[PDB]
Amino acid sequence: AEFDADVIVDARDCIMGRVASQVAEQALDGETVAVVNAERAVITGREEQIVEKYEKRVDIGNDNGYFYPKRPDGIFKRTIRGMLPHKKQRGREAFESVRVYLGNPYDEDGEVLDGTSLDRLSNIKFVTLGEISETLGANKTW
Amino acid sequence: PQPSRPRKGSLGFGPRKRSTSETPRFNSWPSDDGQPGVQGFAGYKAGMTHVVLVNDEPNSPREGMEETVPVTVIETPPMRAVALRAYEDTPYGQRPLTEVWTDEFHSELDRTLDVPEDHDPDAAEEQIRDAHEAGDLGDLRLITHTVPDAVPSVPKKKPDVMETRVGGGSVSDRLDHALDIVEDGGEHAMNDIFRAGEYADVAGVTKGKGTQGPVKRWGVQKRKGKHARQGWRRRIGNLGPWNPSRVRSTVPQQGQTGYHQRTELNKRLIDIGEGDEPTVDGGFVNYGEVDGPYTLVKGSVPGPDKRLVRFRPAVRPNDQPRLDPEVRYVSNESNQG
Amino acid sequence: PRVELEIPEDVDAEQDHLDITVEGDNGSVTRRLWYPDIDVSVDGDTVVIESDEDNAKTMSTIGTFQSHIENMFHGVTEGWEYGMEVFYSHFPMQVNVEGDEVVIENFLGEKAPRRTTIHGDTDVEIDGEELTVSGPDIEAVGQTAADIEQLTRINDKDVRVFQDGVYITRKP
Amino acid sequence: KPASMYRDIDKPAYTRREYITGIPGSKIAQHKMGRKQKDADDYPVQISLIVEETVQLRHGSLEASRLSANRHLIKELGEEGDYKMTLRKFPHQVLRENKDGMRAAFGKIVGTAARVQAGEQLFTAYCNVEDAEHVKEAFRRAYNKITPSCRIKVERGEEL
RNA sequence: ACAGCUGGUUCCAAUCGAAACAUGUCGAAGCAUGACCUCCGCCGAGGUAGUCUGUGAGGUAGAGCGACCGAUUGGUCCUGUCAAACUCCAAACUUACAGACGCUGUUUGACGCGGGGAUUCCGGUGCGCGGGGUAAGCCUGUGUACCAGGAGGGGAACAACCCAGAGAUAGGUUAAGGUCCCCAAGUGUGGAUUAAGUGUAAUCCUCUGAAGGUGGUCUCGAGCCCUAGACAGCCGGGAGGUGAGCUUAGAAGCAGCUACCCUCUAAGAAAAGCGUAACAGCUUACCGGCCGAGGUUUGAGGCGCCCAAAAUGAUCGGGACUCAAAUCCACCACCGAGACCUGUCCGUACCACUCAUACUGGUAAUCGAGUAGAUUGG
RNA sequence: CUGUCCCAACGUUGGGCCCGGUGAACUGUACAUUCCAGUGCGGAGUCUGGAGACACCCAGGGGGAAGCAAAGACCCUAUGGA
RNA sequence: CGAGUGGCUUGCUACCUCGAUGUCGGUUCCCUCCAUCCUGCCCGUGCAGAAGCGGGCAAGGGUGAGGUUGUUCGCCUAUUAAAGGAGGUCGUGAGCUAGGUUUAGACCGUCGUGAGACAGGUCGGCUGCUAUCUACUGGGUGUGUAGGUGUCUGACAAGA
RNA sequence: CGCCACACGGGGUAAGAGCUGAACGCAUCUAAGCUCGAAACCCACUUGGAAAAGAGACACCGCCGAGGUCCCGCGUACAAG
Ligand SMILES: [Cl-]
Ligand SMILES: [Cl-]
Ligand SMILES: [Cl-]
Ligand SMILES: [Cl-]
Ligand SMILES: [Cl-]
Ligand SMILES: [Cl-]
Ligand SMILES: [Cl-]
Ligand SMILES: [K+]
Ligand SMILES: [Mg+2]
Ligand SMILES: [Mg+2]
Ligand SMILES: [Mg+2]
Ligand SMILES: [Mg+2]
Ligand SMILES: [Mg+2]
Ligand SMILES: [Mg+2]
Ligand SMILES: [Mg+2]
Ligand SMILES: [Mg+2]
Ligand SMILES: [Mg+2]
Ligand SMILES: [Mg+2]
Ligand SMILES: [Mg+2]
Ligand SMILES: [Mg+2]
Ligand SMILES: [Mg+2]
Ligand SMILES: [Mg+2]
Ligand SMILES: [Mg+2]
Ligand SMILES: [Mg+2]
Ligand SMILES: [Mg+2]
Ligand SMILES: [Mg+2]
Ligand SMILES: [Mg+2]
Ligand SMILES: [Mg+2]
Ligand SMILES: [Mg+2]
Ligand SMILES: [Mg+2]
Ligand code: NA
Ligand code: NA
Ligand code: NA
Ligand code: NA
Ligand code: NA
Ligand code: NA
Ligand code: NA
Ligand code: NA
Ligand code: NA
Ligand code: NA
Ligand code: NA
Ligand code: NA
Ligand code: NA
Ligand code: NA
Ligand code: NA
Ligand code: NA
Ligand code: NA
Ligand code: NA
Ligand code: NA
Ligand code: NA
Ligand code: NA
Ligand code: NA
Ligand code: NA
Ligand code: NA
Ligand code: NA
Ligand code: NA
Ligand code: NA
Ligand code: NA
Ligand SMILES: [Sr+2]
Ligand SMILES: [Sr+2]
Ligand SMILES: [Sr+2]
Ligand SMILES: [Sr+2]
Ligand SMILES: [Sr+2]
Ligand SMILES: [Sr+2]
Ligand SMILES: [Sr+2]
Ligand SMILES: [Sr+2]
Ligand SMILES: [Sr+2]
Ligand SMILES: [Sr+2]
Ligand SMILES: [Sr+2]
Ligand SMILES: [Sr+2]
Ligand SMILES: [Sr+2]
Ligand SMILES: [Sr+2]
Ligand SMILES: [Sr+2]
Ligand SMILES: [Sr+2]
Ligand SMILES: [Sr+2]
Ligand SMILES: [Sr+2]
Ligand SMILES: [Sr+2]
Ligand SMILES: [Sr+2]
Ligand SMILES: [Sr+2]
Ligand SMILES: [Sr+2]
Ligand SMILES: [Sr+2]
Ligand SMILES: [Sr+2]
Ligand SMILES: [Sr+2]
Ligand SMILES: [Sr+2]
Ligand SMILES: [Sr+2]
């Protein structure tokens, strides 16, 4: 489905939380952001502990519910939601004008935001979002 | 320190509510091993009878001897595969692409569907082939319906429509096999997919029992001894502890029992035939007389008589196939008596 | 730091990002040498492993990258050969190579055959009571030979009495 | 009883025996060990066990750490070996226990403890150059049986 | 009926503003008399919350005891320890009086005196010093500031922790705290450390984490060895007199006893460790060679790791963060209260004028929070 | 001897459910769709942080409202009573 | 001898509740913890084998029936792979039970001049309520997405 | 109380067994890398699930007519619905 994006962001080799922090700030300023290649987005640290944290969130829940996403599609969306006052009017409008995607559905290349890019030649202790999703049990469709 | 005991009833068939479709819907299909073919069939439950059979298992001490085996008679007349649906591999899973229909429609099909008058089967076929060239074609399934009119004991003439997967060799060869079945009139029988002795998976919407208490619904105890005479007979002890201050959905409570979909695994097909051979004297109670294409399923089958059941080649068999068992006797004795 | 390794005349060395392909007469081996701030490049005739950092963790891996590259040189020229001998006390053991895997039958009197898959382009050759595992990739040969010794593992009974099994005799 | 109940200096100095009665005797057998007839200056090496934290060490803890320290020297250098160890601290602080709820709470006398400040030498050994590594192991066993962390400081010995 | 016991007791505003303590009490759920709050009248020039100096009082901390006293080691003077009810010593500090400076009072009358009215005598917390108790969100003192009766800003929430004491309205600048998003302000600068998501937790019932351990890693130093080739590895040599003597059937490097001697030489033990019934066998010492650059030993510091087990759903508030959005050392720029500055207005007090407490003009850096209660105008 | 129990089933009668008519009471500071943790006079639907949550209605068995009903019978206290 | 963790035992305190938060044991039904009894995979042995003994990972599942006793605990029997422990207001009385504790009747022993007492024993001895909110189990009606029929997809959710 | 049905196998790990391997010329299962390995984890399998607010997809019928409701005879359904 078509989405009139102002800013198209390439998450490839980029630190998730840092991209998320900027995307939320832009969404509140009225921008229509679209995070692309989220499966290839990165999160620094020891894989084993990162997965433990995300697996605990999948195990947590009850009758009221704690729906935690397994796909990198939704994991990124939830990370952005946590940086937004989503229950307020202004924050919900900001959130609904931000959409994360698997790959790139557009014709344009996404712009790599400043200070978010991770140098692979200087780092080995990190995980890709797709790698977390595969361990969580999500069906690989990318 | 108060003895341990497994909880009352399973939590895997939840929520225990009424089924959306009376027509069963398979959630899994067999692998692509052999030659191209339709991965399922459907029929209408008739009733039960026993059969005398010769033991087929080589590991059994009683090999060759006469064994009495219970059997459910299911009337399985030829169905019609009216169309071929194609799925595409989108980043959000499998989504339907297009459908290739026919010209030859069963007279009584307009009781469920809005029958196609103007369709383009060639352009739709091309769309599926471009998707195959692009390498984005998911799986190929056939829209199928039954002919309840061919069954005299079943009151309905309104066809039961369901989708069934085509599995087999390569994606190119099974696309063509699917199109061939459709183009004719879609007419196929139980013989085309199944052979006697094969293990099938039977799915059905169970016998409706309305609202029932925890004892019947979850298999909890009745109040014992002195506790049975105080004003509480078939009600559970407590709805939960003080803390958490809420009732958990895991505690056995009242509600809908029956009319749920169940998929009974590894059902041996004793015999497939056509005639009045499995019929009971005086007719099957609350059904009628069987004189046509049938199947004899070993043991029980979910749902009551007249209900539509579905077949699928076993996705998880334990034993190796022992084809065409020797049926020495079929009981024709009255189910009344 | 910087360490230069001269490639032998029999050898050809190429590079694709972090991957290094080393070719020769006994075959070809491709390895991925990735570590923070360590750049491994082919300077036409020599292989250079250099870094701007001199810390213990960086130095550890520079030394590891050296041995890995030098081993690929030996592998594509001379090759890697591990020698093995089969021993049995009561039951005649049948050690055979069936396709892409080495099978061990009637081990310690078992009815069920013990099997393990051969790693890479490694070749296991049987000569009655002696076995010789060989190939260009030390990782693949070292493991395939190890896998065979491990295949006859016994945890339930005393290993000193029940000594049956294939063992490594020669390590290169 | 655990040393958690007595390790800290939080009560006043309670040592005055002319006002305190029924005080249990010290479990400490000897204070001067080894060759007590010989002088301390007759030895080249002098190593002390320095207590890092200010504490109260019970007589039973003092005897356990003294016994396991000297017993190692008796094993490695012999029963009449050429060494002389000294425990310079004496258990002067009298300890109570309230063993009725909190009414008339003043405890009955249960034992004694030695008040040792931080940086102080609890044990001080005097040995020869060959027996310097045997005495470092005697103090390594001794520090495990008292409450604080310790330093094994070599005071008079540039033989390394 | 009485009750020292519970509950309730109705309009506005202005000024001041407690005590939860002492003595006595069949008193401890209550009173009385004091302390303390308030109002009125009198008196008429001093006053003393701070500091400095002078003249005095003092034995707590610390310390020490061949200075008393009582504890408490060992050796053939020397040597090892202590004290709430010890002291040859001895503070900081508290305190009496006076002088000086400061501040204050003489129309705002201080200091003080007399009289009327109370309330109060369940307190609590933080910090310092305590005493009891294993400990306690424990019990019981003391000094002090706060809550009670104290707003507003910060701390996720949160009486007493930080900023801050506050008339209304308005502009501005800061305080504590904070500047990646949620969220106002930095994805700031120079530099280093950490790989554990350690950590992102001032204080705390609340934020644990210990003894012990750590070739995890960073940094600083000391001794020794080294191109006359160090450290390690690998190769070669590790020889005879003789298989030492005694012991013994035997013991021949290697059961035990004693000695532990000298040739050859570049080394090679009367043998350091396995091995054999005893031999034999494999190695260590020691020497040579190949190789080629620092190596080895010890001391100290920083951050981390191990030690580390709990009950409905994990957490630094959350998101999440790794040359940081952590930590430590400096630095730069900002955000951020009702505080501070500033305009106008109000109340109250005082001054000038006045019959006035009606106007008008003036002063307040040294006026403006408040439960019980005293006083007063409406 | 037997359904007390293993271990529960089927049935019978009156209710229960729907319709006409009749028609109360208990209870109500307010707000109120909650759940998990935290915090707070240490036992929170309402405070903090998150999670979840479209509204209304029917039937149910009673987990919570430290549920409703009773100015605790127990304990101590009062210069109470009998 | 020294250092800790837990919050299951007991004790301490008196913060919360005296215009009442029903109480031991049991029962019934649900969730959980791991310091693991069995089952899976491992290391060591004073590991021949068989059978053990000790240790590690691990909480998916299981851990049952009975004789005395109100008992919890425990003692005992026969089975068993094993017949583990603990938290949830010592989970659970607007669920049950009333055997115990805990009134008013009575007896015995002990104590008391006596009325009477007992942290002794013994027989008997009462258990209210029509669910407003919330919570969950199942069942409907609407609105949203924006003409209809049929077929599906799968974010998430549950399972032993 | 009767009868029928309820895997195997993948993937990633723990404890553990190892390979290659350096810091530390040797050695070393670990520091980077890799092969294995639990009834436990994920998938497999069953059940629910367009109210998933990114509120979905496909095909055909239809917008003056497709379809639906009421009505009528009944149950494979059912306390009302
Ligand atoms: Cl959930
Ligand atoms: Cl919000
Ligand atoms: Cl890294
Ligand atoms: Cl019961
Ligand atoms: Cl003030
Ligand atoms: Cl994290
Ligand atoms: Cl007025
Ligand atoms: K109470
Ligand atoms: Mg019959
Ligand atoms: Mg019959
Ligand atoms: Mg007033
Ligand atoms: Mg006024
Ligand atoms: Mg002193
Ligand atoms: Mg008050
Ligand atoms: Mg901002
Ligand atoms: Mg942490
Ligand atoms: Mg209640
Ligand atoms: Mg009362
Ligand atoms: Mg009484
Ligand atoms: Mg009287
Ligand atoms: Mg464990
Ligand atoms: Mg054995
Ligand atoms: Mg469990
Ligand atoms: Mg109990
Ligand atoms: Mg209870
Ligand atoms: Mg209850
Ligand atoms: Mg009751
Ligand atoms: Mg009731
Ligand atoms: Mg009785
Ligand atoms: Mg009784
Ligand atoms: Na991160
Ligand atoms: Na979840
Ligand atoms: Na009743
Ligand atoms: Na007492
Ligand atoms: Na009275
Ligand atoms: Na009094
Ligand atoms: Na009183
Ligand atoms: Na003056
Ligand atoms: Na002091
Ligand atoms: Na008082
Ligand atoms: Na104040
Ligand atoms: Na605040
Ligand atoms: Na963390
Ligand atoms: Na007042
Ligand atoms: Na009956
Ligand atoms: Na009323
Ligand atoms: Na309830
Ligand atoms: Na009376
Ligand atoms: Na503890
Ligand atoms: Na307790
Ligand atoms: Na209670
Ligand atoms: Na009970
Ligand atoms: Na388990
Ligand atoms: Na019993
Ligand atoms: Na209760
Ligand atoms: Na009870
Ligand atoms: Na009751
Ligand atoms: Na596996
Ligand atoms: Sr910004
Ligand atoms: Sr289907
Ligand atoms: Sr499905
Ligand atoms: Sr009853
Ligand atoms: Sr609660
Ligand atoms: Sr104290
Ligand atoms: Sr210690
Ligand atoms: Sr004083
Ligand atoms: Sr920055
Ligand atoms: Sr920096
Ligand atoms: Sr608390
Ligand atoms: Sr430590
Ligand atoms: Sr005012
Ligand atoms: Sr005022
Ligand atoms: Sr004031
Ligand atoms: Sr009811
Ligand atoms: Sr554990
Ligand atoms: Sr076991
Ligand atoms: Sr019985
Ligand atoms: Sr007992
Ligand atoms: Sr219980
Ligand atoms: Sr009773
Ligand atoms: Sr009586
Ligand atoms: Sr009694
Ligand atoms: Sr709306
Ligand atoms: Sr491992
Ligand atoms: Sr929809």
Side-chain angles (χ1 to χ4, degrees):
Chain A
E2 287 178 90
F3 193 55
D4 195 279
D6 287 16
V7 193
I8 303 174
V9 180
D10 184 46
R12 190 189 180 118
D13 294 305
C14 303
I15 300 155
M16 182 197 220
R18 289 179 189 276
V19 182
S21 188
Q22 281 186 241
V23 165
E25 167 71 282
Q26 280 190 53
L28 283 161
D29 281 352
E31 300 293 313
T32 312
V33 196
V35 185
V36 132
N37 290 307
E39 72 271 11
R40 282 186 160 125
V42 151
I43 162 179
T44 68
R46 188 183 153 236
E47 181 175 31
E48 277 73 14
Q49 80 95 340
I50 293 176
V51 168
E52 274 187 85
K53 190 193 192 179
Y54 285 82
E55 274 187 308
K56 186 59 177 199
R57 289 179 179 181
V58 170
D59 295 318
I60 277 164
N62 38 26
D63 288 328
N64 190 266
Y66 193 100
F67 151 70
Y68 195 76
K70 303 181 182 194
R71 297 231 273 104
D73 213 352
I75 297 173
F76 212 119
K77 196 64 183 292
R78 181 61 59 86
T79 305
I80 294 167
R81 205 183 74 168
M83 288 165 202
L84 284 170
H86 72 281
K87 284 173 177 163
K88 283 191 161 191
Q89 176 209 91
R90 191 183 97 269
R92 192 196 176 172
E93 289 170 359
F95 184 59
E96 292 181 344
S97 61
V98 170
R99 287 188 195 177
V100 181
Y101 300 97
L102 290 172
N104 204 140
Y106 298 118
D107 299 301
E108 292 182 73
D109 276 299
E111 61 170 270
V112 172
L113 304 168
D114 289 86
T116 70
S117 207
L118 184 88
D119 181 41
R120 282 186 176 249
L121 307 174
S122 291
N123 285 281
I124 206 165
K125 288 183 82 163
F126 66 97
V127 217
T128 234
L129 278 195
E131 286 170 321
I132 295 173
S133 298
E134 281 180 83
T135 305
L136 294 175
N139 184 245
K140 187 172 180 179
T141 178
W142 53 89
Chain B
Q2 192 173 119
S4 306
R5 160 217 61 153
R7 45 101 29 64
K8 311 299 190 181
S10 170
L11 250 26
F13 306 85
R16 244 92 165 205
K17 55 170 281 177
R18 285 172 195 168
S19 198
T20 306
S21 290
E22 193 171 276
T23 293
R25 308 294 173 178
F26 285 112
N27 78 131
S28 187
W29 295 106
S31 64
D32 306 312
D33 271 47
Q35 292 177 250
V38 192
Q39 298 188 308
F41 207 68
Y44 292 92
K45 189 174 169 183
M48 290 189 89
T49 11
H50 57 279
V51 113
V52 182
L53 225 60
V54 171
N55 196 317
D56 291 69
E57 204 164 60
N59 297 314
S60 181
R62 278 186 47 88
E63 190 185 15
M65 296 180 209
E66 287 192 308
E67 218 163 85
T68 305
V69 162
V71 117
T72 302
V73 180
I74 292 160
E75 288 214 79
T76 43
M79 295 199 301
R80 307 287 169 89
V82 267
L84 177 270
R85 182 174 270 175
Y87 285 76
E88 57 179 319
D89 284 338
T90 61
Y92 311 110
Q94 290 190 340
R95 288 191 188 207
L97 228 198
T98 355
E99 278 164 50
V100 180
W101 289 74
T102 30
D103 307 273
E104 280 185 12
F105 295 115
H106 181 254
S107 59
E108 311 258 76
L109 187 59
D110 53 357
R111 283 178 171 267
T112 327
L113 281 151
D114 277 330
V115 181
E117 283 184 64
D118 288 279
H119 184 50
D120 196 336
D122 301 274
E125 192 177 328
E126 198 199 309
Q127 198 176 324
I128 302 172
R129 286 194 148 109
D130 282 326
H132 187 4
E133 276 185 68
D136 289 317
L137 188 66
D139 66 338
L140 298 138
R141 312 197 205 163
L142 302 170
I143 305 293
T144 322
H145 76 260
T146 60
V147 186
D149 213 340
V151 199
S153 301
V154 177
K156 71 202 283 190
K157 299 164 200 175
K158 176 177 167 76
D160 285 305
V161 189
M162 64 270 272
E163 209 175 286
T164 302
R165 196 181 171 268
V166 192
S170 64
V171 264
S172 295
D173 286 311
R174 73 175 175 255
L175 204 159
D176 276 284
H177 177 64
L179 288 167
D180 275 339
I181 303 166
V182 180
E183 291 301 289
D184 308 304
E187 203 178 300
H188 56 305
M190 189 78 169
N191 291 313
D192 302 16
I193 305 155
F194 298 96
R195 177 109 98 106
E198 287 181 324
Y199 287 99
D201 284 346
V202 184
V205 169
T206 58
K207 299 185 78 173
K209 290 163 192 305
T211 44
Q212 301 290 323
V215 181
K216 184 173 172 75
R217 196 182 199 224
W218 299 97
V220 314
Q221 280 182 22
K222 294 204 311 178
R223 298 236 175 163
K224 300 301 157 181
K226 203 159 215 172
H227 309 299
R229 286 177 270 118
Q230 315 308 311
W232 288 267
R233 292 185 183 281
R234 17 181 61 232
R235 296 173 175 179
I236 64 166
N238 61 263
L239 294 172
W242 194 317
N243 273 302
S245 305
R246 52 193 184 83
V247 180
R248 286 198 211 248
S249 61
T250 64
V251 329
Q253 285 188 82
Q254 162 255 61
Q256 253 286 335
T257 345
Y259 208 81
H260 313 133
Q261 189 194 284
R262 287 297 177 260
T263 303
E264 224 79 57
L265 265 36
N266 304 341
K267 294 270 135 160
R268 201 184 182 213
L269 307 183
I270 300 308
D271 180 48
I272 305 167
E274 184 168 342
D276 63 317
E277 275 72 90
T279 320
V280 150
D281 287 332
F284 282 99
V285 196
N286 257 274
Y287 186 71
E289 300 179 309
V290 176
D291 189 34
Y294 66 91
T295 301
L296 298 188
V297 177
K298 184 178 174 198
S300 48
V301 152
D305 314 313
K306 296 160 183 179
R307 211 189 291 300
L308 175 93
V309 298
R310 278 231 261 171
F311 299 91
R312 170 232 270 173
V315 292
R316 46 181 279 186
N318 284 304
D319 302 318
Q320 201 68 76
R322 284 126 61 220
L323 307 169
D324 305 83
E326 196 190 310
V327 191
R328 289 201 188 158
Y329 183 64
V330 180
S331 199
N332 293 297
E333 196 189 27
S334 182
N335 278 357
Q336 304 179 60
Chain C
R2 180 190 172 109
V3 289
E4 295 162 44
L5 293 173
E6 292 193 288
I7 86 167
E9 55 171 286
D10 209 90
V11 190
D12 256 317
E14 204 173 18
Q15 196 206 343
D16 182 55
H17 299 320
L18 299 159
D19 314 275
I20 302 165
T21 314
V22 172
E23 296 172 71
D25 290 318
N26 202 44
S28 50
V29 189
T30 308
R31 278 188 66 80
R32 191 170 183 216
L33 300 194
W34 185 28
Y35 197 81
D37 303 299
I38 297 182
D39 284 279
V40 190
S41 59
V42 189
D43 188 25
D45 53 291
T46 55
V47 179
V48 179
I49 301 157
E50 62 177 350
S51 180
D52 277 323
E53 281 183 303
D54 60 309
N55 64 66
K57 290 189 179 177
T58 303
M59 291 307 281
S60 290
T61 315
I62 283 170
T64 298
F65 281 177
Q66 194 187 309
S67 290
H68 282 358
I69 292 170
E70 289 177 336
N71 280 0
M72 289 194 268
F73 286 164
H74 185 98
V76 301
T77 59
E78 289 171 65
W80 295 102
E81 302 201 312
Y82 284 74
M84 296 186 304
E85 273 185 84
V86 52
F87 178 70
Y88 62 93
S89 55
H90 191 91
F91 286 98
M93 207 193 304
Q94 289 178 69
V95 191
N96 293 89
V97 183
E98 290 173 18
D100 306 86
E101 50 188 278
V102 38
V103 180
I104 292 182
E105 292 178 303
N106 202 236
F107 172 65
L108 218 52
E110 291 171 359
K111 283 188 164 177
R114 286 183 173 204
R115 43 181 60 210
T116 170
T117 311
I118 299 163
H119 298 122
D121 303 311
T122 304
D123 305 297
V124 187
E125 282 176 70
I126 181 200
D127 193 72
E129 295 283 80
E130 283 192 52
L131 283 151
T132 175
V133 198
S134 55
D137 189 338
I138 192 175
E139 293 279 296
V141 191
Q143 259 293 309
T144 301
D147 281 27
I148 294 164
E149 189 170 290
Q150 297 299 117
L151 198 66
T152 43
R153 191 183 168 186
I154 180 169
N155 320 297
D156 32 52
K157 297 179 292 306
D158 197 336
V159 196
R160 297 170 303 187
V161 183
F162 296 78
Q163 297 183 305
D164 295 44
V166 188
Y167 293 103
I168 306 284
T169 307
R170 306 181 307 241
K171 289 171 190 176
Chain D
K1 292 298 162 181
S4 57
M5 295 171 64
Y6 303 102
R7 62 185 172 208
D8 311 304
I9 292 181
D10 40 37
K11 296 201 180 297
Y14 195 57
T15 66
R16 305 297 299 277
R17 299 196 177 210
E18 55 258 82
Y19 303 114
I20 315 162
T21 66
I23 314 157
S26 187
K27 290 188 184 177
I28 309 170
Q30 307 141 58
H31 271 81
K32 307 292 175 179
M33 290 149 287
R35 289 190 178 181
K36 52 180 180 178
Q37 291 185 61
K38 202 174 174 192
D39 287 308
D41 300 294
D42 292 14
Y43 290 97
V45 185
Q46 171 188 58
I47 310 180
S48 297
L49 184 68
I50 287 175
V51 163
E52 287 192 292
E53 295 191 333
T54 294
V55 279
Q56 291 209 329
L57 309 173
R58 313 223 290 308
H59 65 6
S61 182
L62 252 1
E63 174 59 21
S65 71
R66 194 231 72 199
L67 198 65
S68 69
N70 201 236
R71 201 200 289 126
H72 188 66
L73 293 166
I74 287 167
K75 187 185 176 178
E76 297 302 303
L77 323 193
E79 298 167 70
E80 283 169 67
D82 201 45
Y83 75 97
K84 71 178 283 72
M85 198 163 83
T86 312
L87 170 59
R88 48 223 310 191
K89 294 301 171 198
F90 284 80
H92 297 292
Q93 178 80 337
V94 180
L95 313 176
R96 320 173 205 114
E97 190 188 17
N98 188 30
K99 61 209 289 175
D100 181 53
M102 280 305 289
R103 161 179 295 188
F106 200 82
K108 69 159 285 153
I109 292 86
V110 294
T112 57
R115 284 193 166 181
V116 185
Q117 296 294 314
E120 286 202 273
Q121 317 168 103
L122 181 69
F123 286 108
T124 301
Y126 303 91
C127 69
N128 296 311
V129 191
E130 301 179 316
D131 303 340
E133 291 305 306
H134 285 308
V135 76
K136 280 187 185 182
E137 185 60 9
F139 283 173
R140 197 232 61 188
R141 284 179 171 227
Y143 71 42
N144 277 294
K145 294 193 176 182
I146 48 166
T147 295
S149 297
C150 302
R151 283 171 183 185
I152 306 171
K153 193 190 175 188
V154 186
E155 198 73 83
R156 285 170 156 193
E158 285 177 54
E159 276 86 87
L160 175 56

